[PDB]
Design a protein around this nucleic acid. Structure first.
Ligand SMILES: Nc1ncnc2c1ncn2[C@@H]1O[C@H](COP(=O)(O)OP(=O)(O)O)[C@@H](O)[C@H]1O
Ligand SMILES: Nc1ncnc2c1ncn2[C@@H]1O[C@H](COP(=O)(O)OP(=O)(O)O)[C@@H](O)[C@H]1O
Ligand SMILES: Nc1ncnc2c1ncn2[C@@H]1O[C@H](COP(=O)(O)OP(=O)(O)O)[C@@H](O)[C@H]1O
Ligand code: BEF
Ligand code: BEF
Ligand SMILES: [Mg+2]
Ligand SMILES: [Mg+2]
Lengths: 419, 419
RNA sequence: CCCGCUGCGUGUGGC
């Protein structure tokens, strides 16, 4: 029992609940009004009411608990938190809070809360002395996020090729670059499925920025976890603040020694939104990029790291290259200077239609020896040496038609060694 | 005992110290409060507290001894030095001062220095009669900094190739120019190891401006010297302040006839920070560079020189090219006009996964006859004549698989002359 | 030969 359940419950159920116990209503107004009336009558009955939300701090000192359904923006229902509670519990923006709430008093249009009992999914006083995110000691990615599933399915081929080309570890700063219609979004979907299957302990938060609504619905339907989105019909500031809220929530989760994974549908459009919202400095680089536009995107992308104290933040963002515009090229080569994993998809392999359309020679990760073991690293070395002389197309066809009949990558390696 | 000595000890040790013979405390507050309390009680005994720092002189006349843990920035404990002491000892910004401090009394908000005992690791009676940095007569580099080792290991190979392409001397202005992912940071790490092993007498300082925090941790746990860092999380103003503090410290050390070596993880990011901080003048160069933006980067880079009076300052920095934005192109081609040593790494050799990915033909140093012997220069000329016709990837493969079987460069030259 | 001390425009986006 909490505010969220009543928010997501069907209108018929809540109208019946108000009808039998409570004053009758014919439901001539909005559902939120009926929810407010039900909350009022339940508070009058004397029963405590629960509430949940992700905290966002305002410049005055008070904060609002935004809801995930509204994609963490302001809305009609936003629990108010006083600066006194924030100071007492040392809360920061992005800290999810669950606790007892109260209906608004006179002159108040938002619910308030009197007690908290779940701060970032644990007992609240643990927030008294936790090490801050910027105070953690970062490290190179040590643990490996194996995307391989071993079921032998056709979609498992993309995960296997991902494992072979550019290994992904915990705390990786990854980029997936390709021209449009080259297989980016479906690669992200396959990555999300592999994460959900292999690594259920990780907190997967798929963030879509400046993307088509149909893809938003597809992600919400076929992804197990949390999906937040901001379609392309929304302003740039919308995308900007959604991204800030998501990254702050991820940082707060990491502060509690959690493994957090974020999949970004496109970092190029996030950089474009940041450029649009940035004040003009009078200096413009190649393309339309403002000189000071890329600081905040750099911070957002570089929030991903491997923490020695425990937990990690992985970010896998897609990007556009070879689109005929220097904006995308400069964005890619500027985020190439801060990322770790790089995966290239080429339109030539996509037109030839052999999927996944991965450019093996142009894709790799930094410090692969820290993820793969010695024998696996040597096998990867041999495979890359064999693949490199061949072109992209024939190498991809040879690899795909060479590991398809093999269930596991280890068996593929040993069969390469045998033959 | 020093103040920094109490900083470096764990909180448990200092709280036990404060509990066994000092006032009892259960440590409910921050560490700095305990440090202040124990220092005040120790001064109340009638003895003398000690401390140390690096001097930064404010525009009003007084100064503060910043600490390395705060990246030589304003922290919550900075020993105050009166203008009288500065005038007495002719102290300038960046001087490392160690001496007797006193606790803050009423009206005093930070610690204060009353007696000094060491200025730049020397008695304070030598700083009054020294020659300022700007008055030292500059000179071309004469003493060679041998990066070679007798190990024969693979990691030595890179250093060896450096000794063949661009010899490095004391007082050089180095530029490791390459696109992203070419190998600049690993090459800088190898240079740091070579400096630490071959030349332990040189003062090695590593400056990382706007780079990955994991690389900062790797430098800290790998470099045998001093590491000062400012990751991309910080703004450009912090970057420039840290840069000026480091360069002032290096200049003060050079004024005492010391060999100082500075390694810059990226001079391009420093130039970008200076461009963002500089006031607009209405004139913008191609690529988005302000017209008056590169003067201070020029001063920072040209602070490196060989001093005839004794000592030297050697700055080796990494730069960026082929990013797709002409900002980096103009920055590199402008720093090439104020440097001595250029070492180029090509992205395509890196994609071949052949390391080091040095561009031998585009790499060289100015006035190499002053750093090498006659026979060594003759052999280097012969090798360059051999290498020049062949392609860059072929050249690097030939060089690597030719000097892999020789422990030193002399054996490589002997086997090339013989065969 | 006697002297008063010291926004937009342009540029940058731009080939
Ligand atoms: N593994 C795959 N199998 C079949 N088609 C694919 C695959 N990956 C991508 N595609 C094709 O890509 C097109 C859409 O591009 P998508 O993969 O969603 O990334 P993006 O839209 O970002 O380019 C679809 O028409 C789909 O047919
Ligand atoms: N001497 C070397 N030996 C082996 N690998 C190297 C060497 N130098 C660079 N690399 C490779 O380069 C990657 C790191 O590149 P880095 O130097 O960080 O790029 P940048 O020069 O743009 O900072 C690592 O994954 C590493 O495998
Ligand atoms: N006539 C020459 N003989 C030998 N070396 C030369 C000659 N002219 C230039 N160099 C080489 O060029 C380098 C200096 O170039 P410099 O003339 O300073 O460049 P800039 O033209 O930018 O001033 C020296 O290291 C030297 O080896
Ligand atoms: F067409 Be997709 F955006 F590569
Ligand atoms: F990718 Be490197 F930092 F240029
Ligand atoms: Mg897409
Ligand atoms: Mg680097």
């Amino acid at each position: 029992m909490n505010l969220t359940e009543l928010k997501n419950t069907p209108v018929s159920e809540l109208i019946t609940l108000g009808e039998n116990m409570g004053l009758e209503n014919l439901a001539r107004m909005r559902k939120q009004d009926i929810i407010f009336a039900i909350l009022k009558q339940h508070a009058k009955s004397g029963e405590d009411i629960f509430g949940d939300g992700v905290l966002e701090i305002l410049q005055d000192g008070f904060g609002f608990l935004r809801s995930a359904d509204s994609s963490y923006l302001a809305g009609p229902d936003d629990i108010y938190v006083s600066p006194s509670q924030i100071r007492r519990f040392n809360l920061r923006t992005g800290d999810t809070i669950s606790g007892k709430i109260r209906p608004p008093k006179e002159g108040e249009r938002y619910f308030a809360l009197l007690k908290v009992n779940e701060v970032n999914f644990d007992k609240p006083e643990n927030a008294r002395n936790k090490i801050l995110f910027e105070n953690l000691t970062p490290l190179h990615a040590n643990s490996r996020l194996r995307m391989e599933r071993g079921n032998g399915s056709t979609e498992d081929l993309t995960a296997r090729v991902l494992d072979l080309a550019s290994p992904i570890g915990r705390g990786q700063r990854g980029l997936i670059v390709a021209p449009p219609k080259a297989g980016k979004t479906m690669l992200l979907q396959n990555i999300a499925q592999s994460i959900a299957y292999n690594h259920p302990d990780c907190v997967l938060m798929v963030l879509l920025i400046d993307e088509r609504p149909e893809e938003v619905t597809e992600m919400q339907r076929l992804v197990k976890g949390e999906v937040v989105a901001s379609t392309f019909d929304e302003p740039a500031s919308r995308h900007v603040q959604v991204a800030e809220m998501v990254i702050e929530k991820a940082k707060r989760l990491v502060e509690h020694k959690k493994d957090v994974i974020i999949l970004l549908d496109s970092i190029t459009r996030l950089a474009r939104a940041y450029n649009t919202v940035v004040p003009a400095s009078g200096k413009v680089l190649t393309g339309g990029v403002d000189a000071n536009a890329l600081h905040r995107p750099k911070r957002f992308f570089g929030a991903a790291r491997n923490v020695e104290e425990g937990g990690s933040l992985t970010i896998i963002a897609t990007a556009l290259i070879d689109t005929g515009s220097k904006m995308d090229e400069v964005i890619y080569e500027e985020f190439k200077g801060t990322g770790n994993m790089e995966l290239h998809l080429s339109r030539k392999i996509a037109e030839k239609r052999v999927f996944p359309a991965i450019d093996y020679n142009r894709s790799g990760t930094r410090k692969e020896e820290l993820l793969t073991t010695q024998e696996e690293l040597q096998k990867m070395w041999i495979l890359r040496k064999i693949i490199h002389p061949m072109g992209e197309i024939d190498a991809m066809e040879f690899l795909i038609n060479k590991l398809a009949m093999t269930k596991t990558n280890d068996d593929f390696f040993e069969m390469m060694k045998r033959s």
